[PDB]
Amino acid sequence: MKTFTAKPETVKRDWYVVDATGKTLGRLATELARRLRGKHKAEYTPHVDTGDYIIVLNADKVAVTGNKRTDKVYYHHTGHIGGIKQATFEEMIARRPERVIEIAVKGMLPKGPLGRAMFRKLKVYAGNEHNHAAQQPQVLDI
């Protein structure tokens, strides 16, 4: 026989809500990446998004070890010459705390169209509230 393949038009995607409060950034991110990709499902298919929708709450309260709160630096280039910009973890948390989780997860997801599609299922919130009560997200402990 031929090995099973998941079919995008018939995939079951569930909704989950995770609390980031006090979680180690990277150890949360891997579990998010795993589930966004659908590596936790027997129907896992590399070319299909079999993963789950995940709401992350309290992104501003994500934890890092060591001196990373002050010393972890996020670099981006603007495309303009000399346009190397930097922000520490603490600055990122102050300004755009959802980006910390989103950046961590993005780097752990596959690159290309499907990896970008997988990332769209991640919904990160700075605080303890979300707008997705209609989707009925189940609590997921990490």
Binding site: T3, K39, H40, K41, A42, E43, Y44, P46
Partner: peptide
Amino acid sequence: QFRQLWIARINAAARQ
């Protein structure tokens, strides 16, 4: 590639 796929699925199902 197929062995890699089977192992990944067995791993998922085993961990369930």
